[PDB]
Design a binder for this molecule. Sequence first.
Ligand SMILES: O=C(NCc1[nH]nc2ccccc12)c1cc([C@@H]2CCNC[C@H]2COc2ccc3c(c2)OCO3)ccc1F
Ligand SMILES: [Mg+2]
Lengths: 58, 631, 339
Amino acid sequence: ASIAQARKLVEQLKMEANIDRIKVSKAAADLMAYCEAHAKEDPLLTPVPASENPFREK
Amino acid sequence: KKILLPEPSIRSVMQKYLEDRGEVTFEKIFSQKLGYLLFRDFCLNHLEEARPLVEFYEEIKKYEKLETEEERVARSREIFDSYIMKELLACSHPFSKSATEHVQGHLGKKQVPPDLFQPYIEEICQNLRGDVFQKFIESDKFTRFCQWKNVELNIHLTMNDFSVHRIIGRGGFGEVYGCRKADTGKMYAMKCLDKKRIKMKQGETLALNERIMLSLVSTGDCPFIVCMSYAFHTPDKLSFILDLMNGGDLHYHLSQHGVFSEADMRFYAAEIILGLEHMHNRFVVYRDLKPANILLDEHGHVRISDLGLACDFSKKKPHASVGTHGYMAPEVLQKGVAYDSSADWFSLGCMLFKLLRGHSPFRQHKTKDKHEIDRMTLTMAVELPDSFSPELRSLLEGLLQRDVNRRLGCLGRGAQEVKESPFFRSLDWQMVFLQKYPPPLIPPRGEVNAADAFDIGTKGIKLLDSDQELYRNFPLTISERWQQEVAETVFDTINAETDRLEARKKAKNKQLGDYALGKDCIMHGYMSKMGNPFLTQWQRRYFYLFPNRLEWRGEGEAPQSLLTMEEIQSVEETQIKERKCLLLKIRGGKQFILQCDSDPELVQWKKELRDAYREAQQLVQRVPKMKNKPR
Amino acid sequence: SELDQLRQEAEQLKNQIRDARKACADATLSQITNNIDPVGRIQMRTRRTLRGHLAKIYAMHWGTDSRLLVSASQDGKLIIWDSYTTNKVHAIPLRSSWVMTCAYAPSGNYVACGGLDNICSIYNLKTREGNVRVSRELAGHTGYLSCCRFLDDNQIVTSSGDTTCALWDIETGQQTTTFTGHTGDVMSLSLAPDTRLFVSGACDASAKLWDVREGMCRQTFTGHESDINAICFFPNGNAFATGSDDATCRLFDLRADQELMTYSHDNIICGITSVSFSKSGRLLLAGYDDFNCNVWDALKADRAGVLAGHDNRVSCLGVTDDGMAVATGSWDSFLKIWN
Ligand SMILES: O=C(NCc1[nH]nc2ccccc12)c1cc([C@@H]2CCNC[C@H]2COc2ccc3c(c2)OCO3)ccc1F
Ligand SMILES: [Mg+2]
């Protein structure tokens, strides 16, 4: 209904359109690389000894 | 046995209860006896800005009750120099120019009527309502008011609430007993009507109308009408709690003493006239005025009793022939002819003639032919004997005028006309109202059979279930009557006891270490919940109702249990062992039963739980994170 | 003619955005990760059960110390628990019974909450005598407060049912910034690790990436078919996950500006109420309305495990900063620590 509102919407869509995007393959590779790089520091993936676990008889 | 006040926490419920009825205003509280007492106690003891205003009000109220003009001459000057003049000197006089001008002009002109300070009454009232009244509402005096009001609104009288003593009256439908109300010690009469007799003679409407008329008249504290303080009923009886009149009626005293002289009948006439004035000011016609319905107290003063045949004419005038043959007005006997108060003036003439002569003026040779008395009343004027004085002759002439156009008291000024009769030249009617004239007949202490009906010449029927419905709204308590009873008996001592108990509990609470403050709590107070129904498990817990939940705690623990408004499906009132209780239906088939200590608590808890659960459910529906989603 | 032209230009711009995104979609995350070994079955047990709340728990939030946590309940209370001992560090009675969210400041000095009162209340934990008192009441939203997250002790970000988010200066109590763009109630927000961006999910079935300092919406993601109830950043800040009433979780990548993965199963029809990543980001934990928590392989989209220890809706969850445990709060009034 509002002309100014529609102008604002068009400018926002311009902002969203004029960005630099990367290929999905590169983004997936980067995510997989982060997961692999930090797998060792994840106590839910690599179970820690119970002595180093605060929630197991400590 | 005695009155026990609820704990001050009752305020939380009561204040809202009264607020739902527009009863926490200045008019509603100040005009009540206990309300005025507590408000005045607050202003005098616990406030400084309002103390002189209340003292002024009280000085004016005591000035109004001064009898002679010289007492008022002295007291008006004292009031002016103490409450008006000095406040004007200190510029702290909060009153209009007109009021000071009126009072000073009457004083300089040496005119001192009893209503001299009425503008000051109005302006003191306007100065007390508001910030002072709000600060009173904030104080613990208003909490004590809530306690007393809960006690008042939880009255449920039974026979066991009265110690019943000797019979002071026998009728064809019941008896009147002298009794004492146990909680206050106030002496009363108890009129018990038998429902089986009522059924046999089809007089249910008469009893209901008697209760309604008693309710209409029992305010204002009329000294000359047998007024009602309470009405209740048992499966077999209807009971009115009335002014104690154990001196017998005037029919018996007429048969005993004989005819009364003019001077003796003048006393009874004046008191009955004041009673009739009180009734007519409230649009009531007694219609049954006769010596049998005029009762005497222990001192000889008289009252009108048995309002069964009275009716309200503020809207509709009657035409039916109701009364006792010999006292009914010509326009009364004529069925299909409207009339109002005029019947009572003619009946007054008849009864005064009977007191002077021993018989109704229209029953002349002991003829029991009712039609003969009718015939004499409707056609032939009464022959007033040579023994009568001319003043009394004019009084009876004017009262016994067969036409209403000429009848004394019906000519546009009412009882006032009868007061101005030359028969009452000597009477100061203020002294009549104050019961200052010596009664001509003082009943003997403790004597017997002073008030039986002339007819004492019995069967019984079963009582149907519908008949008990016919008496559903019979219970009634006159608030002004109960507050006056309490004020003159146990108000101060119970207040002192309760003060002291709450002080001791404050000591204990500040040695052991409030949950409702600082939050959005809607209401809080004591209620009993039911555990195992077979163990009679009732647990008294303090409940807090919040917009989304109802928590409860015991004495010594924080609330460890609650019930959410979301899971409440329905709130309903239900009878459990002859007691009104609350039943909550919970999501999941469960039930949650609550029990209150008083009727106002029950009604308010029901209202608030219903409002809270409905509003909270409607609100939760609109919140995506909180609402129930399909599964 | 101008409003019509603006509408047609907005349509053309949406088409251009979609075509750019499709020009970027050369492969899928499922193809990229097809070669890595599966995680197997993730089996976790309850080490602690936090008992105390008298009604539904709506939200919880771990402290940065990975030990203390705060929770908001239908009983009108916040509780700050020591998860190691199950002892209640603090029990805060709120001024409004309609609490919906809570947050633990990174310093551990403040907590925050709010709800249908349309106010974000900031509670100081260390006062003069050591009591808990309301230090601030941020008022400005015209709708219920759905989520809030501290940037530091002096700035906080809130989301509201008035379709807006906001950045507040706690000291002055002012709305320094308003993030407007959603067309439905904002349900959840998540801060990026560097706290210069944040994402918000809303009932308009869209998520939005905003620049905190600039106060603008940088990106808008669609794809969900119903309300987005929860949102969580991937630990490196380049991706995020959303849980929705459509019974699916979704992984979106920022630099590719589109959706990377859907986490769903034909036997799961109820909605998701909370989402969180494990420390490395390999596991995606999601709370469901069927009383369970599902642990997904974030890289391969397979369901790795289930935490089934609640008798009612799992309304919130959260992994510690050290990744040692995951807390779950439910409509059954209990919190449970899992690993
Ligand atoms: O049956 C009685 N009256 C008829 C009726 N009353 N209400 C009725 C409702 C439906 C149908 C009939 C009804 C009926 C009369 C009386 C006496 C009889 C003699 N004359 C005065 C009457 C008043 O005695 C009172 C004595 C001391 C009192 C008092 C009253 O009050 C204050 O201390 C006594 C008990 C009755 F039971
Ligand atoms: Mg008539």
